[PDB]
Amino acid sequence: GSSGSSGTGERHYECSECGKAFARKSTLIMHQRIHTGEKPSGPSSG
Ligand SMILES: [Zn+2]
């Protein structure tokens, strides 16, 4: 039925942005953030 390991379930989600493989799906999302942001600015301040 809907139960029974019958082996392993390696589910590594890679980042379509860089290509980094993670263990959890959500985790990857949090990472992708690094990409979207840090917009390019001329006058470096901070
Ligand atoms: Zn990435």
UniProtKB/Swiss-Prot annotation:
May be involved in transcriptional regulation. This is Zinc finger protein 484. A zinc finger (C2H2-type) spans 13-35. The gene is ZNF484. The chain holds residues 687 to 719 of 852 of the full protein. It is found in: Nucleus. Belongs to the krueppel C2H2-type zinc-finger protein family.
